[PDB]
Amino acid sequence: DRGVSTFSPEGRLFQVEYSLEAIKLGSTAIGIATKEGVVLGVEKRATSPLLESDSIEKIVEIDRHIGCAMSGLTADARSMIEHARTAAVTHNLYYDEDINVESLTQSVCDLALRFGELMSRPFGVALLIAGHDADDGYQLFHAEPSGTFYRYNAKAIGSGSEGAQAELLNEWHSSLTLKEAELLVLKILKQVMEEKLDENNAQLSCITKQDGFKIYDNEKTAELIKELKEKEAAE
Amino acid sequence: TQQPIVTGTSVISMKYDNGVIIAADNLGSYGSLLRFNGVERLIPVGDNTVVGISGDISDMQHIERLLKDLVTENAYDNPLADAEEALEPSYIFEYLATVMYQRRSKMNPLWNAIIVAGVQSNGDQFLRYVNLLGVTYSSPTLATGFGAHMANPLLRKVVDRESDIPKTTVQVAEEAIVNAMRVLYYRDARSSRNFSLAIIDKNTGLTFKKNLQVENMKWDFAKDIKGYGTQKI
């Protein structure tokens, strides 16, 4: 057939480019970074009404100061999360301190290109890694299966990514509050989702310096959805 | 873990105003048997370094081959091998020191005590010690084995501290070394009269002296000594 680590004539790795197509098919995940915190939100996308939606875990804790949201072949993310958690805890063991968000992201991205003929193929999942440290403050990173990671003020990944990113282009500014960011994620998720957005088919989370990483209750998110509807009807 | 078989005794050395001097006798002992009388224990590396080795001779010959191999390797893909990127005394020492400590850490040591004497690029004197344990230290005077006990005291009367180095000429320094070698011949039971001496000067370069002998020895007073106490005849 052909090699797994083969270059295309354009100078790209076939398998990496193909894994990006799998991520486009995945459910939407959005992250917004502010000076009061970073917000992470996801589309759950249950394949059937009998599926208990609360068991869909597409937002995940790495450490108290680092959270993570995923999009694509979510099964592939489990070993990435495992490595991330281990890397975070291991660094705390060696250095008696929290690990920098960038350093954690870099550790995860080192796995990405360890494939050949090591694992047999690249990861089919993208990650939004959000967190806080004392050096660089609140941060949001986008970790791809290419091994590359970009820092973002705001970022959307998944099926409604390019539409959501264009919306994040206009809406984001440097003086956003945490509450403003929460509503903004819900607004854009609702825009790109097939089904109607509610507290059962969408999930919110955030990371603050004081309280650390927290996944939002369905009751808490429901209020933010109701607050959104009213403010959109206000004009 | 082994035991040393064929052994070499004291290596002695000191700094002077423009460089360093190092010396060692030409004997390879086999226990109490003075087996081999033509053994060179000062091994020059380039024109700026001399490595003096004591202890096990088979391990010395191994170290000698490593240094020979080091010069070859430094020349590979190196247009400045005989200029800016030539081997320094500090490079050669650190290499040996690494090897000695690694070998002791595998419980299979090179059974030696080594003194690397030389002059650096900037004219600075280099003189540092390393042994089978990987222990390292530097001093205006350095000596191994019996030399540590008998040579250092004499050499320290010339250069007692750092500030005495510029005040010490090459003639005074060489005189002290040669006298020390005589004292070691009087008192070390595993030493020989024949020895080699090396001077590394920042101006005149490397001067390697072979086939030196201990001379001007005092023995005449022995004729008067009789018995072990009461005996008169």
Partner: protein, 222 residues
Amino acid sequence: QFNPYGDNGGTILGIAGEDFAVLAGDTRNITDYSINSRYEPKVFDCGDNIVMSANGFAADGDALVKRFKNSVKWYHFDHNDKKLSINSAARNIQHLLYGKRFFPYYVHTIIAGLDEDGKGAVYSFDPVGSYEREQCRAGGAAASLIMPFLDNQVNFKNQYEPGTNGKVKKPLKYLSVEEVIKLVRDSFTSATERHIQVGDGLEILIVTKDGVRKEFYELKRD
């Protein structure tokens, strides 16, 4: 049988001030009854406003210091030139030491510097990695001669206030850098008199917010 360990003698002393820290050590290096060197530096600046000394078997002491300096370098590479805090350095050294738990670095390690609040800090290690933050610690050959003196003159142990007769302790007033250096010098002068492996020279490294400063003093050479 081959014995991979040796004793190079020497003595070191770390004292933590209010907004400073000192790590001192004699410059004599020995084996048995012979002097190897009268000036062989034992306390080292390791960067990031940390000073370190690994007293005992000098080969293991040099190996450890070398590996820690190396750890500081790679900490900068791996974590965006972040400053290695003294508490983080201490934990890192534990893992270096315990890594050779069953063939130990035969040294008593001490590091000194400033904590993240700017206060003076000294950490003390055993050969196999057990460590602890301390206000005062002498290590090495003459440690048994120095520590009791420091308990008395730094922490005012067994000292009470005149007139009260054992009822009121002497208050733990803070010592200046000039006052600490006096106690360090007298500790080493006294140790030199009564311990054969201590002498030749004293080298002190003082750590403040401004950086690392050095001071050298002569000791008796007998």
